[PDB]
Amino acid sequence: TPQTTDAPAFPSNRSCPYQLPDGYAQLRDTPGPLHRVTLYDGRQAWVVTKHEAARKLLGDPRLSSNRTDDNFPATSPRFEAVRESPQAFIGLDPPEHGTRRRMTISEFTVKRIKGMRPEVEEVVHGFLDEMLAAGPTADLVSQFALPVPSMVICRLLGVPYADHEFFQDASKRLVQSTDAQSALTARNDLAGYLDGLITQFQTEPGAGLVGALVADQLANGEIDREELISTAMLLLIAGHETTASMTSLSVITLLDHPEQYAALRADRSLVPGAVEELLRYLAIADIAGGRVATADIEVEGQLIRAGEGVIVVNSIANRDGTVYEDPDALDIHRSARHHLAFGFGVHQCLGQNLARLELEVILNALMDRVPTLRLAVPVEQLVLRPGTTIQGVNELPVTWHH
Ligand code: HEM
Ligand SMILES: O=C(O)Cc1ccccc1Nc1c(Cl)cccc1Cl
Secondary structure (H helix, E strand, O other): OOOOOOOOEOOOOOOOOOOOOHHHHHHHHOOOOEEEEEOOOOOEEEEEOOHHHHHHHHOOOOEEOOOOOOOOOOOOHHHOOOOOOOOOHHHOOOOHHHHHHOOOHHHHOHHHHHHOHHHHHHHHHHHHHHHHHHOOOEEHHHHHHOHHHHHHHHHHHOOOHHHHHHHHHHHHHHHOOOOHHHHHHHHHHHHHHHHHHHHHHHHOOOOOHHHHHHHHHHOOOOOOHHHHHHHHHHHHHHHHHHHHHHHHHHHHHHHOOHHHHHHHHHOHHHHHHHHHHHHHHHOOOHHHOEEEEOOOEEEOOEEEOOOOEEEEOHHHHOOOOOOOOOOOOOOOOOOOOOOOOOOOOOOOOOOHHHHHHHHHHHHHHHHHHOOOOEEOOOHHHOOEOOOOOOOOEOOOEEEOOO
16 A cells, blocks of 8 residues: 655654755645645644745734644654743734733844854854863864853843753753653753843842843733743744854855865855855754644645644745746855745844844854864764754864864
């Protein structure tokens, strides 16, 4: 009996850190905005696989971001045991989404990000000082990719970096949890820690976004204490797992495309466009694409019914050849404008301009200070995270001329 299905298992796992999974190239090539898939629990959902349709559906308020909905298209059991906790604004819809998001936007403006350049540059070069002084070989993830954005986001939040061993471990356990119990434990660890931080700010008002939320909105009853915890937790985790993943994956990708990496080193004005192309090409955050319909939506002759889960797969939409000519070619010189790596619409990544600053500083610093950087193992020996979490590698052995 043939095993062919019209609802393939989703998500798929990468076999090469920067290439579309084989099942995804098939979804990309099949006409139409939507395709049926089967999720880990056997439930069918839709995936959005085309670029303009993805923008349309991310902008449609009939596609709710509410994870507590029984029909939300969960791709693993990660959140099934944490539903008794309030959602951060990533899981809220208007009007609640905006009231919560607006409590945080002041920390992420273009002006604030510009003012953060000296701090980001100091942090990047400090961790490089230490890594290069110890000599090769090193794990780029633990020694550079993770600590840099962790220190930066901690200062933005008012989270003391002295606790980094504890919160970096809990963050990893939650983001990469494979069972509901391990996710619950990691989330509880972070929640109790952040709750104590709130009490400390109530005793001694202090700097950072958490301190600002405690002194203002919490003291006015405009955010619940547990919502503050969830918001701080989202910003802490997103603030260091996403950039760390982009750093390690960009290094792997650039070293696999040496002609472009050399062109990048010779003309640093190409760095901002290279970062956009790497964001498009590596598209690390498909796990942020889930939505649930609260009303019927007709999409080019296909019908999303109320109550159906829909996943906007931005990595596949970013390989739409009607937008990016030869979409599977890495080209740091191409226009990667309009990519969906950060989403689109009211939920478009709050941290996107901090991420862009960090990646530009990081790439320029690696080229300046470690021009002989190379991988210490073959690419095929790296262990890639599965499609049920943020894409990337947990370890990246590197060497250089000592
Ligand atoms: C480094 C590369 C990054 C990528 C690829 C990425 C990806 C994404 C995506 C695709 C979304 C959309 C979520 C949705 O539509 O449901 C999102 C939202 C969000 N991201 Fe980023 N992100 C990155 C960096 C960051 C950083 C550094 C922060 C800092 C805290 C951050 C904080 C957030 C927040 C708070 C949201 C929710 C926005 C909202 O719901 O209004 N992200 N991210
Ligand atoms: O959403 C998941 O399954 C993993 C997870 C856990 C805790 C906090 C955030 C995330 N995911 C996540 C991250 Cl780390 C960044 C941007 C968007 C999303 Cl959905």
